[PDB]
Amino acid sequence: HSKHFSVIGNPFSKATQQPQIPDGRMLESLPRRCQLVTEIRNNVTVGSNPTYILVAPSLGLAFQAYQDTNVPGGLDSSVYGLQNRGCTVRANLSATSIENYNDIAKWRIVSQGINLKLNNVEDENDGWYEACRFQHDWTPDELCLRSTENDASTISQDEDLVMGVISSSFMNGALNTIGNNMVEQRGYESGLLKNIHKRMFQLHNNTSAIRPKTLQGQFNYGSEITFSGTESEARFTDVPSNRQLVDSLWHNDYDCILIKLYPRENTGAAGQTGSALIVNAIQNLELQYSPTSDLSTYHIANKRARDAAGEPF
Amino acid sequence: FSVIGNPFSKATQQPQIPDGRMLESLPRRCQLVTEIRNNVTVGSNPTYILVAPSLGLAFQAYQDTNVPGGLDSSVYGLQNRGCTVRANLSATSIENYNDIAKWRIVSQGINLKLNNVEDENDGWYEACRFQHDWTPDELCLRSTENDASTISQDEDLVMGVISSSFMNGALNTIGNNMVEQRGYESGLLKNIHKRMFQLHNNTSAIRPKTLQGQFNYGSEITFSGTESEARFTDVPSNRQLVDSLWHNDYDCILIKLYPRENTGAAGQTGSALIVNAIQNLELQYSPTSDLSTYHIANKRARMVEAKL
Amino acid sequence: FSVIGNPFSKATQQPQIPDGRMLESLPRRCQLVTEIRNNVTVGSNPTYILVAPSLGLAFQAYQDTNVPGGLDSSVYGLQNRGCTVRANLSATSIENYNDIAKWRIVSQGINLKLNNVEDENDGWYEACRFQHDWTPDELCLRSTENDASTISQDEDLVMGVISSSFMNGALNTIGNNMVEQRGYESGLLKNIHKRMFQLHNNTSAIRPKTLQGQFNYGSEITFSGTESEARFTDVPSNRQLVDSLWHNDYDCILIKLYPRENTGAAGQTGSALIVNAIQNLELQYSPTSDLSTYHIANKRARMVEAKL
Amino acid sequence: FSVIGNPFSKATQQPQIPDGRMLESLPRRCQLVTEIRNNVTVGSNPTYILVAPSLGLAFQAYQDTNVPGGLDSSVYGLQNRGCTVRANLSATSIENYNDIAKWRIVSQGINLKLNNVEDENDGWYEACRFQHDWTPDELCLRSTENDASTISQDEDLVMGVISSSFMNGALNTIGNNMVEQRGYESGLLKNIHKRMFQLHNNTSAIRPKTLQGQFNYGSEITFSGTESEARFTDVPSNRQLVDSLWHNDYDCILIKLYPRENTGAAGQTGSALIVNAIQNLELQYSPTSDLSTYHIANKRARMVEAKL
Amino acid sequence: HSKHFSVIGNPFSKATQQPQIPDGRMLESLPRRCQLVTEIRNNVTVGSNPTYILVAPSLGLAFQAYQDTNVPGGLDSSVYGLQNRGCTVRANLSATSIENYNDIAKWRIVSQGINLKLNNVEDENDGWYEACRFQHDWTPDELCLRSTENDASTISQDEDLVMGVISSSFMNGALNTIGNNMVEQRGYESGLLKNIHKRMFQLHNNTSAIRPKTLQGQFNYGSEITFSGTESEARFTDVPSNRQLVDSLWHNDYDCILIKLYPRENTGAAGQTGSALIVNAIQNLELQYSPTSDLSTYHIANKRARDAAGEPF
Amino acid sequence: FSVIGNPFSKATQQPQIPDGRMLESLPRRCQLVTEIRNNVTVGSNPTYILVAPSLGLAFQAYQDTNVPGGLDSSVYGLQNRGCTVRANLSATSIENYNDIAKWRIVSQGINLKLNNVEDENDGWYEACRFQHDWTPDELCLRSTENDASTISQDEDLVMGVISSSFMNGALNTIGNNMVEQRGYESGLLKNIHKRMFQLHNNTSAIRPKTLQGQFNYGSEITFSGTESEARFTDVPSNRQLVDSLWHNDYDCILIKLYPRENTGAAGQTGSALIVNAIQNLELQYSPTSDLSTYHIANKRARMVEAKL
């Protein structure tokens, strides 16, 4: 069980391609390492206002970034989801349901984290950051469904989806409040971007008894889920069905990480095009699949074994 | 504790799960024995038995001679042992009249014996366990009477699957992919008697389910106008009901039967099976709510005798 | 083992008698807590609390404010714990509807606490245990309802003494000669809260009493026209009924009380006692005789489905 | 671990549950001390003290002199310790303005002391603990103000039982059958000062309840036009609110009181009880949602000073 | 490479769960063992006419049976396909194409075979059989698309499909001709059904250089594919598009096996309900997946290693 | 205990000073992070940062871009963490609204990081600690808002130095004799990031300072008519105030900066510094004095319900 402990806590760890939590709460589950690499750069429209990166325990979501250069259409944040990897739900608009097309019965997170590296030339390598972890009490009308495609079109039939926060949360909602009061948050850290590659930001569990969330094959929705006519976004009201859906897609046994960025401004002028971070998100999952699924046959017995934002990457 | 035991143990069985998740709990042994037989309607097509972690359901049998009216499966309930809910139609609710506050399963299983003469002992079977991502519209309320009439006042109910799951739903899909499932086995019916089929828990931290004293419902539960069944849509109220009567900390078992055909004639009357089903429960009871039989006397003394 | 234990003791309370005389027995704890007070008609005369090894009886109290209609004693029973018989008048029999096949007592007794204010806390008592040679004409049947109506169909019954025993019968005679009796004690009522009175067995080999499902009677049991009491003559049948409801392997307890007078006025309202009777039973049950609320399906599979 | 400890014990009082189920939690001790008395309208009927695992509620008392307007029970809350939710009527939501993300109870209970003079110190009580299978229509929201006005904006709320439960509902039914319940005790009120009543957990794996920052409601919560109470129907939303304010991993305590009568006159003014409720909580907090009194300066240095 | 040789030829072989042909023609492919168990019983309507079992090298098809008790609706044969196993195509009727939803780029058959066991009581255990292998020159109008569901409904959106032969081929087409002239076929064998469990019928390759077939993501079709209004069947005309589709789904580097059955008649009378065979088909495949696929990440390097119908099962 | 520790310890830090001089004290961690930049007005002359043992002052920075109106320095307060006093102008007093009875400092320090691109990373610095014989007319009250307007009602205040001390007062004299002071160091700004500057206590017996609930003042405190500052004369009242908010059991730190010049043009915008200041306090709190939010209920029971 040594390799499992190496991966547990430390997502950036090539110890085993089969990471599981050995607590006996998921007998014969299936590991899944999902990795994503991308570039985060603050866009021109945010100006000198701070930007953000949110790492949340949502299923299939690597992270969410506010006012970077990949924001689609009229939305102010980008979702970086892990698609075509067997750990996403999709939009069965014809049946008006959220379809569990991979047939995941139960799921939890073995570990999750990001590492960021500044790649600007040394004459443009300024900017700083703060980071914290927190255990916010989410309401569904603060959350939303985003197409993993992160594109500028309405959510269409069979579109892959992940749960994110509404973009305005960064501007005037919960995440703005946390970002304005970072120093009082747990695990507070601050530093320069030129050094941020030394850090590994991993999610932490708020309990030692992490129970998997459950999912139905189809989750039928009424008018409480409003699909945008323009954006790739669907919004919730705070009603029982949306609370059930949030429970099934947002694992509340883990805390979130928020990184607030004061980057070099992006204006368009010659040497003034922002701060570019190479990002390396990883989400290590434990799944139980339903027999109808393709990935059912790869199940493997899992038998019981006997507070700072960043760590030294 | 890792895995739940075998209810048909000649050895000694633990009355409860010794983990400290249900303090001062009481064990309830529920057992049903009955003969079942594949009916004539199903002809030469296979039949099915489903054992589910559903409170008070001994098993559900697809297309046996007991099927009521137009429904295509039978349910066998343990309502005589005090572990079912009933239908309170006047108050339009599911009533928890046995005062169960919390329940889980210590062990549950089934054992079948072929009761056929020597020259009619053909047939065979496949069996497996599975963890399925149930949607509520795949489940339903069935009367434990398993009779041909509508659900009426104070009818005992169990949660089972809509009969169509067996023919073109989830159970058919599993029924056709048995040999790839976990815990697969196959054999001849004349040998099935030496097989104890037991449910497996999918977690070692089994938390009890909670029941309300009354579970109220609106139009999302449709009671059938002729049959002893009520259907669910997939809405928040019905998910909560499914969460109270179906224990998703346990997998299900599907037995697929290829029985000797029953044409309703001598020599060809199907494969009679003696079924022994046990559901060992662990219960925490709420206070008795119906004292209609009790003699409740005023505990304060009278100042003076009623004589004066 | 030699002697039974204290039901109120908080020290390793045995649920059975470890003598091997009742194999696969079950325990049953039956407790009643209530307040009582001497009434006005008894005046400055003594009152009594009898604790007897009668099946289902917590205690009998002479001349308290609860005495029904024209009877002079109150019976307090444990009918709500399913340890009684009832009147089957339409069959003219005493019905053992709780299906008790055999019974004995594991422990029994009462604890009394004075519930008067400090300037009204006078009074004293004498207490003893004894082994009277009861005759069935000294005993009677009483409705546990303890009401001023006649015994009706299915009314719960306990065997107690006739009320006139306390006044001019065996209990009065014993009450007048308490120091000669075993276990004699006396004290002030304001200190009685410290006494855990408990029945004693007069043999270390306590054999269970037996009960029939029905005990038919003739004219030897006279039901009062107006009172909730039935009387006995001394004939073989009544002796046989006495033997099944009164365990004579145990001694009785008589508590004679000399309380503050109840005249009905302010400051002269008697002595209120909070009584805490307990009767712990060891039972061998007989199979459920009433299955009117069971579902009993035919255990043989139909040959063909009903819709054919 | 197995069972929670005694909040009144002066012996190594754990501030947390050492089970690892709430990492970086914080403790919160909430204590209320007050006097109560039975009122005149209840007369010679019993009164009740309920202690429940509801968030922020010290205890609920049936028919004491503090009952607000036309309600028959008083709620006593710990709002001053920041462990409550409040009414956000202008958003039609229940506001978790104290930013509690998750909570469980470490220990809870009450101690009662009789505060009558020695010539008025009569009365007695029965006490038990139980694990009722609550339905949301038996519960309600109550303003901790405990006043005779309607629930206003930002009014602090605790979840308690509807007052009619004590009279003709589940609590009355439990109150009539106390000896059947676990932990049964009885005694005189003049001795109740010796009892440290304490809640019990019904599982050794107590998982924290969760709270949202806002809990929006529709018509399923009816606010009284005249009283400081809001009522529930049994619908999915109310069940979800019940689950966040009522920790059902714990049992409730019912104390049934038979006190000296309050007729309003001299020497007949009831039984005064000094109540010492404590609720010890383990909390995981969520980041401060209200920074209206914070100073938030821009963290980026200006390029130039303002006076230029 | 010993386990690979054990599985190659011998499909019923628990030597390795990763069987591949080590000829170097599929570098870094992915094995797939697909297994099916069912019952074949001659139905009442075929009377005393012979029945058939066809084992063909079609993708995702275990075998096809003529006039058994599972024939759906008005069709005279049953398809037993391997569904929910990552090796099937489906019917994108909305886009009017045959969709390669698992994104298989290249595929071939490592081995394929069946074993049959009679399960009638000894007083009803008569009947005999003949078997042969052959290398028929197929025309597309002899083939067709069948829903793997083998049900009595029209092919609907996203229905799983396999290639089979048209049912009438057994009655008056190529398979009737082969069945009538079995003795002249290669590998001819004949026997009693009570002994047929001793035999293992495996497909054989007609070349030592087996080249994988290729598949597109979408295969668009015109009116040359006619979907039944009633049955779960789509028929071909002999046109270029249908020849391309047949090439992509029917591997012509292997021969077919045909078993002709003379069973105990099924009439309905008491002891006269046919011959019941427990069937254990296995198809061991070698696939190359396209990167978009879920099963892409499980690719494994495959480096070069250096005539009778039945064998002793 | 000899010397106070380093607030930026990767190791584990003592929450309090373990000497027994503040029993039942509570620790308060106060931290401020912000970017500062030398302004244009100061031109090529050096700038300064002062860290003082002043309650709630994170640091004071001479001539940075945040200077308000006509004042020549900025203050950075920790008023969000509850360790400052405020201005009660209606009662003409300094109000101790956080109810601090006694306070000292466990550890206090600062860490600066140069946030400048590679071709603008010039500059250097000298630093030292000093014990100065402060006179009150060298100190002043500053608004923590650090804004361009007069001090108004309930304004949070910290004690800092008059800005002129930096240019021609005590701090300039020290600023020019840095290399003779205790704990001198110098370096390049591009290297200052690896330097933890911490205050040193000048005694090992650190006694807490006391604050009044209200500190009244007369004309000896002059509030500025345009700026957010109040000046002191040297009179007995002002010495007592300086003794309550400035802890002379600790030395100060002066960092003298020779930054890259800021002309307000691209390429020449000064030396941006990320400042991390921590003041770890040890506090003894007085009882809460503002209960405007509390619900204070009468603890005495009503004789009769308000209903009658």
Residue numbers in the entry:
A (entry chain C3), E (entry chain C3): 60 to 365, 378 to 384
B (entry chain B2), C (entry chain A1), D (entry chain A1), F (entry chain B2): 64 to 371
Published text:
Bacilladnaviruses is one of the major group of viruses infecting eukaryotic algae. They carry a circular ssDNA genome of ~6 kb, which is partially double stranded (~700 to 800 bp) and encodes three proteins; one coat protein, one replication-associated protein (Rep), and a third protein with unknown function. We present the capsid structure of the bacilladnavirus Chaetoceros tenuissimus DNA virus type II (CtenDNAV-II), determined at 2.4-Å resolution. The capsid protein contains the widespread virus jelly-roll fold but has additional unique features; a third β-sheet and a long C-terminal tail.
The capsid was reconstructed by imposing icosahedral symmetry (I4) and using 33,507 particles to an overall resolution of 2.4 Å using the “gold standard” Fourier shell correlation (FSC) 0.143 criterion. The CtenDNAV-II capsid displays T = 3 symmetry, i.e., 180 capsid protein protomers assemble such that the asymmetric unit comprises 3 capsid subunits in 3 quasiequivalent positions termed A, B, and C. For subunit A and B, residues 64 to 371 were modeled, and for subunit C, residues 60 to 365 and 378 tp 384 were modeled. The A and B subunits were close to identical: the C terminus of the A and B subunits form long tails that end on the capsid surface around the 3- and 5-fold axes, respectively. Contrary to the long tail toward the capsid surface, the C terminus of the C subunit is directed toward the capsid interior. The N terminus of the C subunit has a small α-helix on the capsid interior that was not present in the other two subunits. For CtenDNAV-II, the two sheets are formed by strands BIDD’G and C″C’CHEF, respectively, thus containing three additional strands (D’, C,’ and C″) compared to the standard viral jelly-roll fold. In addition, a third antiparallel β-sheet with seven strands is intertwined within the jelly-roll, i.e., strands from the third sheet are formed by extensions of loops CD, EF, and GH of the jelly-roll. The unmodeled density in the subunit interface of CtenDNAV-II has a pyramidal to spherical shape and is surrounded by six arginine residues (R84 and R270) that resemble an octahedral coordination geometry. CtenDNAV-II is placed together with RNA viruses from families Nodaviridae, Alphatetraviridae, Carmotetraviridae, and Birnaviridae (Clade 1), thus corroborating the result from the DALI search as well as the previous HGT theory by Kazlauskas et al..
